[PDB]
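ZP: hey, is the idd594 complex queued? I don't see it on the tracker
AM: it wasn't, my bad. submitting now with these inputs:
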Amino acid sequence: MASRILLNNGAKMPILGLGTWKSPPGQVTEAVKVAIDVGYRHIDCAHVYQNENEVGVAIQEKLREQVVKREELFIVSKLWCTYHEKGLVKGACQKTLSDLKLDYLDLYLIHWPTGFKPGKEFFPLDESGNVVPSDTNILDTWAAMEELVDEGLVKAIGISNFNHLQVEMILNKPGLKYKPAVNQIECHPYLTQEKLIQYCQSKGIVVTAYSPLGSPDRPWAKPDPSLLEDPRIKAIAAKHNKTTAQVLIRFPMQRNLVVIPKSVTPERIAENFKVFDFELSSQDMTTLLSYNRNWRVCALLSCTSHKDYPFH
Ligand SMILES: NC(=O)C1=CN([C@@H]2O[C@H](COP(=O)(O)OP(=O)(O)OC[C@H]3O[C@@H](n4cnc5c(N)ncnc54)[C@H](OP(=O)(O)O)[C@@H]3O)[C@@H](O)[C@H]2O)C=CC1
Ligand SMILES: O=C(O)COc1cc(F)ccc1C(=S)NCc1ccc(Br)cc1F
């Protein structure tokens, strides 16, 4: 299969990237180095993950080694919720740029639609545990994102964890200058996202699937359904002489999605890339879709009263 998808900014995005949430800072530099050595050309990052400096060390070393050229990499990061303010967006982007050792990002996303009170804490709470909102809306945040394109800091802008109506808000914005290129959302066989994917794809927005393996290392995991251990998915994998993870990665690829599995295990980083030499049948695809149960890795009770919390 073709390795890149065309975005509505005219640039091409690798359909397979390396996730970095939870990648320990003492492991992620090697993980990214290995990933680039074995063919990855897309890294998914975020300031809130607290490891962009270490990701950046890897990127810079591989550029300095001339393993890759900068134009061949597709580096994605995300604006955290406490920086939804006109006067904070540029500096947030620039901190990410400085940490990643870059002069531009290929794609910069609004990480979640909700703005929170600015400050040192990533999740400012009231004394009863509710997140403290910002009054700044997704449209004003979007205008700030558009400025980053116009200043050369980012080549593309997009959104993440935006629901149907929030995507529509963005598309209907008065004076919209740049459409979102991407909506990055959770997507896997237990949360197949057909409705949101069809909406987004119908509008030309590319969808990136996060937590494609069901985020087994998520910190709130309970001893919960498990994609990697689902014998029905294992059976499809066995039939194709592939791993369950490889099936779980190939699945979104054949839906015209980008997918960003995370690993810090070198052998798995390599395994996860070996997904361009086999095809799931239409019956396999429909069978995997049939496993939907509307199960989310990423949700957060403290944020559920925010006006713009995306999920119900
Ligand atoms: N925009 C957003 O709000 C969000 C974005 N994301 C992005 O998506 C990425 C991927 O999602 P994430 O939630 O991390 O979870 P994933 O679904 O990618 O699962 C990661 C887990 O799977 C394990 N694993 C990886 N490959 C294999 C394999 N071949 N066999 C068995 N186990 C394997 C990893 O172990 P190990 O590392 O030990 O090898 C790790 O424990 C994130 O890292 C982040 O970049 C995720 C959530 C939210
Ligand atoms: O968010 C990620 O990329 C991965 O997850 C995280 C990554 C971090 F570095 C810190 C917190 C999270 C959490 S708890 N994320 C879920 C979450 C956050 C905010 C809102 Br609005 C809703 C929600 F569901």
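AM: back. Residues 86-100 form the longest helix (15 residues).
ZP: great, adding it to the tracker
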